[PDB]
């Protein structure tokens, strides 16, 4: 990649530019968005982002030692297709 | 979960509410944000969201039939910790 790592800060700048919205506002939106995705996953919600992918909490049964649960992302078809060479 | 599936549309509403920003603006920001994450992954960038997790393109070598590549998400520690029971 020309830019090897794109950060949250880089994305705020790119989104401010693309939308013409204030950087201060985009920054507040991104932090709130991630907080709300977290909150939803903590409640056991699926977080479905049409056209992008789904976050969900997956479980490992105790057999697997004790039962555990963890966050995961299932990429959508559009995203899978765009990342193919 | 009280809300079994949280959608992109639900998140726009939750973020508008939390930030006091206009729904039209939050909607534009979210669509741009996801587009820019996609674009970065298509270029082979890592997308690092401090405090949330990292998206990256992973490869399967041809041995595995032909070589393939696919998007993946590695959740960060904070998110992993919040999703534990």
């Amino acid at each position: 990649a020309a830019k090897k790592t794109v950060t949250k800060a880089d994305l705020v700048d790119q989104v401010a530019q693309a939308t013409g919205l204030k950087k201060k506002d985009v920054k507040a939106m991104v932090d709130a968005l991630l907080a709300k995705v977290e909150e939803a996953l903590a409640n056991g919600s699926k977080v479905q982002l049409t056209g992008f992918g789904t976050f969900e909490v997956r479980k490992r049964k105790a057999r697997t030692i004790p039962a555990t649960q963890y966050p995961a992302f299932k990429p959508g078809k559009a995203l899978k297709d765009k990342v193919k060479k």
Side-chain angles (χ1 to χ4, degrees), chain A:
Chain A
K3 197 170 158 30
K4 300 202 167 298
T5 307
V6 172
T7 64
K8 184 167 42 155
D10 292 327
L11 288 168
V12 164
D13 287 337
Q14 288 176 12
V15 175
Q17 185 161 77
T19 60
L21 298 159
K22 298 180 230 70
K23 189 196 309 307
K24 82 184 199 203
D25 287 347
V26 175
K27 164 64 172 161
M29 292 179 185
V30 179
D31 287 344
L33 175 66
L34 300 176
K36 291 295 173 183
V37 171
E38 188 171 81
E39 182 187 313
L41 292 170
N43 290 328
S45 296
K46 308 290 172 273
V47 175
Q48 173 219 115
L49 302 179
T50 287
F52 183 76
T54 304
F55 299 92
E56 69 193 355
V57 177
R58 292 189 192 159
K59 290 172 216 301
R60 318 190 183 91
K61 297 172 216 183
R63 23 171 232 59
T64 301
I65 81 142
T68 49
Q69 63 188 43
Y70 62 96
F73 175 74
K74 179 146 200 303
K77 182 170 194 292
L79 181 59
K80 285 188 283 183
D81 285 341
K82 278 214 75 212
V83 166
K84 295 178 185 208
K85 255 287 180 152

PDB file of all heavy atoms in Angstrom, chain A residues 46-55 73-79:
ATOM      1  N   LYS A  46     -26.144  -8.160  17.531  1.00  0.00           N
ATOM      2  CA  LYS A  46     -25.410  -8.188  16.260  1.00  0.00           C
ATOM      3  C   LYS A  46     -25.403  -6.739  15.744  1.00  0.00           C
ATOM      4  O   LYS A  46     -26.400  -6.045  15.892  1.00  0.00           O
ATOM      5  CB  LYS A  46     -26.123  -9.078  15.242  1.00  0.00           C
ATOM      6  CG  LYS A  46     -26.475 -10.478  15.706  1.00  0.00           C
ATOM      7  CD  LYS A  46     -25.272 -11.389  15.894  1.00  0.00           C
ATOM      8  CE  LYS A  46     -25.666 -12.719  16.557  1.00  0.00           C
ATOM      9  NZ  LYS A  46     -25.680 -12.741  18.048  1.00  0.00           N
ATOM     10  N   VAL A  47     -24.307  -6.303  15.129  1.00  0.00           N
ATOM     11  CA  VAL A  47     -24.215  -4.982  14.574  1.00  0.00           C
ATOM     12  C   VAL A  47     -24.029  -5.211  13.078  1.00  0.00           C
ATOM     13  O   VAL A  47     -22.965  -5.603  12.630  1.00  0.00           O
ATOM     14  CB  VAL A  47     -23.059  -4.160  15.163  1.00  0.00           C
ATOM     15  CG1 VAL A  47     -22.957  -2.851  14.443  1.00  0.00           C
ATOM     16  CG2 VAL A  47     -23.267  -3.932  16.648  1.00  0.00           C
ATOM     17  N   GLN A  48     -25.068  -4.904  12.324  1.00  0.00           N
ATOM     18  CA  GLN A  48     -25.115  -5.178  10.909  1.00  0.00           C
ATOM     19  C   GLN A  48     -24.891  -3.859  10.159  1.00  0.00           C
ATOM     20  O   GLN A  48     -25.626  -2.893  10.363  1.00  0.00           O
ATOM     21  CB  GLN A  48     -26.501  -5.767  10.569  1.00  0.00           C
ATOM     22  CG  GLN A  48     -26.769  -5.953   9.090  1.00  0.00           C
ATOM     23  CD  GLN A  48     -28.210  -5.582   8.777  1.00  0.00           C
ATOM     24  OE1 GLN A  48     -28.418  -4.515   7.972  1.00  0.00           O
ATOM     25  NE2 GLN A  48     -29.134  -6.216   9.303  1.00  0.00           N
ATOM     26  N   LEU A  49     -23.875  -3.814   9.310  1.00  0.00           N
ATOM     27  CA  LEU A  49     -23.555  -2.606   8.540  1.00  0.00           C
ATOM     28  C   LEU A  49     -23.716  -3.025   7.089  1.00  0.00           C
ATOM     29  O   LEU A  49     -22.811  -3.585   6.479  1.00  0.00           O
ATOM     30  CB  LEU A  49     -22.150  -2.101   8.843  1.00  0.00           C
ATOM     31  CG  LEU A  49     -21.837  -1.759  10.293  1.00  0.00           C
ATOM     32  CD1 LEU A  49     -20.411  -1.299  10.446  1.00  0.00           C
ATOM     33  CD2 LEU A  49     -22.804  -0.660  10.719  1.00  0.00           C
ATOM     34  N   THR A  50     -24.911  -2.778   6.553  1.00  0.00           N
ATOM     35  CA  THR A  50     -25.257  -3.187   5.219  1.00  0.00           C
ATOM     36  C   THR A  50     -24.209  -2.673   4.253  1.00  0.00           C
ATOM     37  O   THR A  50     -23.856  -1.503   4.279  1.00  0.00           O
ATOM     38  CB  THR A  50     -26.654  -2.631   4.809  1.00  0.00           C
ATOM     39  OG1 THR A  50     -27.666  -3.356   5.511  1.00  0.00           O
ATOM     40  CG2 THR A  50     -26.893  -2.779   3.335  1.00  0.00           C
ATOM     41  N   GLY A  51     -23.684  -3.575   3.446  1.00  0.00           N
ATOM     42  CA  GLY A  51     -22.717  -3.207   2.444  1.00  0.00           C
ATOM     43  C   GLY A  51     -21.294  -3.259   2.911  1.00  0.00           C
ATOM     44  O   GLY A  51     -20.397  -2.994   2.116  1.00  0.00           O
ATOM     45  N   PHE A  52     -21.084  -3.608   4.188  1.00  0.00           N
ATOM     46  CA  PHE A  52     -19.752  -3.607   4.807  1.00  0.00           C
ATOM     47  C   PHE A  52     -19.495  -4.937   5.530  1.00  0.00           C
ATOM     48  O   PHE A  52     -18.705  -5.756   5.074  1.00  0.00           O
ATOM     49  CB  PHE A  52     -19.569  -2.383   5.712  1.00  0.00           C
ATOM     50  CG  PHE A  52     -18.204  -2.284   6.335  1.00  0.00           C
ATOM     51  CD1 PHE A  52     -17.124  -1.865   5.588  1.00  0.00           C
ATOM     52  CD2 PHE A  52     -18.002  -2.639   7.657  1.00  0.00           C
ATOM     53  CE1 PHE A  52     -15.857  -1.759   6.142  1.00  0.00           C
ATOM     54  CE2 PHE A  52     -16.742  -2.528   8.241  1.00  0.00           C
ATOM     55  CZ  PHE A  52     -15.661  -2.099   7.475  1.00  0.00           C
ATOM     56  N   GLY A  53     -20.231  -5.197   6.598  1.00  0.00           N
ATOM     57  CA  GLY A  53     -20.119  -6.476   7.287  1.00  0.00           C
ATOM     58  C   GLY A  53     -20.856  -6.460   8.613  1.00  0.00           C
ATOM     59  O   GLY A  53     -21.537  -5.499   8.935  1.00  0.00           O
ATOM     60  N   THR A  54     -20.761  -7.556   9.346  1.00  0.00           N
ATOM     61  CA  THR A  54     -21.475  -7.667  10.619  1.00  0.00           C
ATOM     62  C   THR A  54     -20.515  -7.977  11.752  1.00  0.00           C
ATOM     63  O   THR A  54     -19.693  -8.898  11.641  1.00  0.00           O
ATOM     64  CB  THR A  54     -22.539  -8.754  10.505  1.00  0.00           C
ATOM     65  OG1 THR A  54     -23.407  -8.426   9.391  1.00  0.00           O
ATOM     66  CG2 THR A  54     -23.352  -8.943  11.771  1.00  0.00           C
ATOM     67  N   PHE A  55     -20.676  -7.246  12.855  1.00  0.00           N
ATOM     68  CA  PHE A  55     -20.005  -7.619  14.093  1.00  0.00           C
ATOM     69  C   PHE A  55     -20.951  -8.433  14.983  1.00  0.00           C
ATOM     70  O   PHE A  55     -22.159  -8.183  15.055  1.00  0.00           O
ATOM     71  CB  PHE A  55     -19.560  -6.378  14.857  1.00  0.00           C
ATOM     72  CG  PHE A  55     -18.585  -5.510  14.130  1.00  0.00           C
ATOM     73  CD1 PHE A  55     -19.029  -4.434  13.332  1.00  0.00           C
ATOM     74  CD2 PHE A  55     -17.225  -5.720  14.260  1.00  0.00           C
ATOM     75  CE1 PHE A  55     -18.100  -3.618  12.725  1.00  0.00           C
ATOM     76  CE2 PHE A  55     -16.309  -4.880  13.652  1.00  0.00           C
ATOM     77  CZ  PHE A  55     -16.754  -3.863  12.858  1.00  0.00           C
ATOM     78  N   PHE A  73     -15.919 -10.185  13.411  1.00  0.00           N
ATOM     79  CA  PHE A  73     -16.465  -9.469  12.240  1.00  0.00           C
ATOM     80  C   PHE A  73     -16.568 -10.423  11.071  1.00  0.00           C
ATOM     81  O   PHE A  73     -15.642 -11.185  10.805  1.00  0.00           O
ATOM     82  CB  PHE A  73     -15.533  -8.341  11.897  1.00  0.00           C
ATOM     83  CG  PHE A  73     -15.888  -7.600  10.660  1.00  0.00           C
ATOM     84  CD1 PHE A  73     -16.968  -6.722  10.634  1.00  0.00           C
ATOM     85  CD2 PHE A  73     -15.081  -7.715   9.550  1.00  0.00           C
ATOM     86  CE1 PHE A  73     -17.251  -6.009   9.493  1.00  0.00           C
ATOM     87  CE2 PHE A  73     -15.351  -6.991   8.400  1.00  0.00           C
ATOM     88  CZ  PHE A  73     -16.449  -6.163   8.359  1.00  0.00           C
ATOM     89  N   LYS A  74     -17.736 -10.399  10.418  1.00  0.00           N
ATOM     90  CA  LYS A  74     -17.990 -11.197   9.236  1.00  0.00           C
ATOM     91  C   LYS A  74     -18.101 -10.212   8.063  1.00  0.00           C
ATOM     92  O   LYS A  74     -19.111  -9.488   7.950  1.00  0.00           O
ATOM     93  CB  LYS A  74     -19.298 -11.961   9.383  1.00  0.00           C
ATOM     94  CG  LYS A  74     -19.592 -12.777   8.141  1.00  0.00           C
ATOM     95  CD  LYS A  74     -20.292 -14.066   8.451  1.00  0.00           C
ATOM     96  CE  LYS A  74     -20.136 -15.038   7.292  1.00  0.00           C
ATOM     97  NZ  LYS A  74     -20.644 -14.487   6.002  1.00  0.00           N
ATOM     98  N   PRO A  75     -17.099 -10.199   7.184  1.00  0.00           N
ATOM     99  CA  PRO A  75     -17.186  -9.230   6.103  1.00  0.00           C
ATOM    100  C   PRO A  75     -18.274  -9.583   5.114  1.00  0.00           C
ATOM    101  O   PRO A  75     -18.513 -10.761   4.865  1.00  0.00           O
ATOM    102  CB  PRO A  75     -15.823  -9.332   5.414  1.00  0.00           C
ATOM    103  CG  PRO A  75     -15.302 -10.625   5.770  1.00  0.00           C
ATOM    104  CD  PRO A  75     -15.846 -10.956   7.137  1.00  0.00           C
ATOM    105  N   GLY A  76     -18.927  -8.555   4.608  1.00  0.00           N
ATOM    106  CA  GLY A  76     -19.931  -8.710   3.600  1.00  0.00           C
ATOM    107  C   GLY A  76     -19.368  -8.984   2.242  1.00  0.00           C
ATOM    108  O   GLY A  76     -18.180  -8.811   1.989  1.00  0.00           O
ATOM    109  N   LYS A  77     -20.250  -9.397   1.337  1.00  0.00           N
ATOM    110  CA  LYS A  77     -19.808  -9.739   0.003  1.00  0.00           C
ATOM    111  C   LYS A  77     -19.142  -8.606  -0.757  1.00  0.00           C
ATOM    112  O   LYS A  77     -18.125  -8.809  -1.449  1.00  0.00           O
ATOM    113  CB  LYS A  77     -20.981 -10.235  -0.822  1.00  0.00           C
ATOM    114  CG  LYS A  77     -20.556 -10.644  -2.220  1.00  0.00           C
ATOM    115  CD  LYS A  77     -21.679 -11.341  -2.921  1.00  0.00           C
ATOM    116  CE  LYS A  77     -21.225 -12.072  -4.178  1.00  0.00           C
ATOM    117  NZ  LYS A  77     -20.790 -11.142  -5.256  1.00  0.00           N
ATOM    118  N   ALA A  78     -19.725  -7.419  -0.676  1.00  0.00           N
ATOM    119  CA  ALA A  78     -19.143  -6.267  -1.374  1.00  0.00           C
ATOM    120  C   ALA A  78     -17.698  -6.000  -0.954  1.00  0.00           C
ATOM    121  O   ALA A  78     -16.828  -5.738  -1.791  1.00  0.00           O
ATOM    122  CB  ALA A  78     -19.994  -5.035  -1.161  1.00  0.00           C
ATOM    123  N   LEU A  79     -17.457  -6.079   0.344  1.00  0.00           N
ATOM    124  CA  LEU A  79     -16.124  -5.842   0.890  1.00  0.00           C
ATOM    125  C   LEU A  79     -15.187  -6.978   0.473  1.00  0.00           C
ATOM    126  O   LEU A  79     -14.063  -6.735   0.034  1.00  0.00           O
ATOM    127  CB  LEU A  79     -16.202  -5.693   2.398  1.00  0.00           C
ATOM    128  CG  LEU A  79     -14.842  -5.417   3.045  1.00  0.00           C
ATOM    129  CD1 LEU A  79     -14.193  -4.152   2.530  1.00  0.00           C
ATOM    130  CD2 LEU A  79     -14.930  -5.435   4.561  1.00  0.00           C
TER     131      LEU A  79
END
